[PDB]
Design a protein around this ligand. Sequence first.
Ligand SMILES: Cc1cc(C)n(-c2ccc(N)cc2)n1
Length: 298
Amino acid sequence: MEMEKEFEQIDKSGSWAAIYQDIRHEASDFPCRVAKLPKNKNRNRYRDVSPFDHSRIKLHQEDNDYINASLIKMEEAQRSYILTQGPLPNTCGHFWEMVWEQKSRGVVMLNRVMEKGSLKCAQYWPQKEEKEMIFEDTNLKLTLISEDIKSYYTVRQLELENLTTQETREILHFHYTTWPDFGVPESPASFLNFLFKVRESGSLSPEHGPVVVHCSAGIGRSGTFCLADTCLLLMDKRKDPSSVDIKKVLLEMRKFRMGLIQTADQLRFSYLAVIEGAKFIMGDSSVQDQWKELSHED
Ligand SMILES: Cc1cc(C)n(-c2ccc(N)cc2)n1
């Protein structure tokens, strides 16, 4: 019943794979007609990762309205998120147009541009103050104002300008730079410290448009972030924080975008994250670092 006691039983039985396969079989199926049009082929990273028609974000400019991006509206938790793929070389302008039009304050990135020698996302933001980016197709300018590089994540201040009007906005870029090449993090401490920094910035407040969250495909790591955040919000709002069933929250999220959480390891990490996050919020600091054995395994 208590989330933590369910966790212990699933670990003892080795039943993470079976639970993850039940989720896959139970998940919603809705049409993705627009994503599958032939003119949109070069706007999708993968043929089998598409936004549903009912929840897709529409671009407003005169032109093709299509971006691979979904609005996740969690009504009981009172938060929304846009989940999207990492931009491609030809959809960086579309990505910033969406940020502009939806009034987002924050962008959350859960991957590196290159991983295991392969390109996972385009370089969609400027690395140097003095070398701004212009997106000619969507008439947007983007400048790096500052950045703060820490061991597990980096936080940037960006200035986004609509060149049609000369209106400008400050956008916060939260970049988790240490997700492992294979699997999931051993400990959720650094992920939680990252989530709490995002919250602390004000970027998730209802004063703003939905935060934009992405990885490479916009379903696996991205899913973990949004699922952890929403379960923690529900634990604070409910009379009994043990009422929170992670599996039922995840199926709810999957009405808005397919494939959220892509492996049994991602499922187990999300549970671990919520359990530790709740402990921390309730007054246990021992969860905020990982203890290391003296070893030289590499
Ligand atoms: C559903 C629902 C109800 C509310 C207040 N939001 C929401 C939308 C956007 C942000 N940034 C925060 C919250 N989503």
